[PDB]
Amino acid sequence: SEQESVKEFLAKAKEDFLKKWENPAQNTAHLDQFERIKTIGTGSFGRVMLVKHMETGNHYAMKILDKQKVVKLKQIEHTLNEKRILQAVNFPFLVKLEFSFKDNSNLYMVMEYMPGGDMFSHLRRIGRFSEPHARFYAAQIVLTFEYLHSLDLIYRDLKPENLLIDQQGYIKVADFGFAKRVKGRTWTLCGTPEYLAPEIILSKGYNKAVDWWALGVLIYEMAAGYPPFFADQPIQIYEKIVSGKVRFPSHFSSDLKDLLRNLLQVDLTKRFGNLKNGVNDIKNHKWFATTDWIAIYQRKVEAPFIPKFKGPGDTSNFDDYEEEEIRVSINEKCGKEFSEF
């Protein structure tokens, strides 16, 4: 009934999700309702811009995908997954999708804006997080994966770049570009090199255990300041991952190392998160013996770090990108491919 209060929450969470999953929100705004301010992210998989919604004056982060470019990258089904999943989920540590729409040329997903920036930014600059600091963030990802995995979702891109820091110092997971709802096994080669579980690299069928492996990587990176497996090129990273060996900094506590040995376990029959006890093997480990799990969910734990507020609209925590116009063709592109978006 400790773990059974958890089940009452998770069964209600599931009812809520299934309603939206089976009946997704569609066409809830239009481009010319937003003022474009700044590009705060780019990449092969679209771009992200700070925008202001005119009728409210709220700031949001607007993801823009070129439909023709999605097709070329063979990410149609993955993009349909991203939007359908994000419009259906509701958890304190997931970024909220406020609007979605499309025009002749692009797809748009408008999320709440987090002026605080990504964890990546802050972690690289500070160098490393203390164990208590690492633990606070890791507890939020533990709860988030509990949530997601109970909905049959695998997330598949855990890394500091995808975690935003809010105004209270708590985390928000963004970018669901590889998230998928799957019972049983799946096979797609996706993720980021440093975070991939051995089973992905070896093209085996895999499951939600790959998210628990990635948690191992993240905790390590947070607490060490560098990842457990690094080299100059991906192929050298994969050799290290599939070797079975991992070295821990001397400042790592004996409880942290033991947690990590169990998350970064090549043998799926022994990896924490994947066994008969599930998430509780993680939640009840000695490293999290001080962690009040409900207090974390309710955001009543004091955060180790709160980013400096410079206003709504401030972009000081993001880098500078080349501004590219939003072309909207007069002919509809890829209508059938993205009909459900």
Binding site: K74, L189, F230, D232, Q233
Partner: peptide, 20 residues
């Protein structure tokens, strides 16, 4: 040191996702 090796590497910036 391991830290010095990381900081001198080509993979200290934001990392891109892979795909097939």
């Amino acid at each position: 040191t391991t830290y010095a090796d990381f900081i001198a590497s080509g993979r200290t910036g934001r990392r891109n996702a892979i795909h097939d």
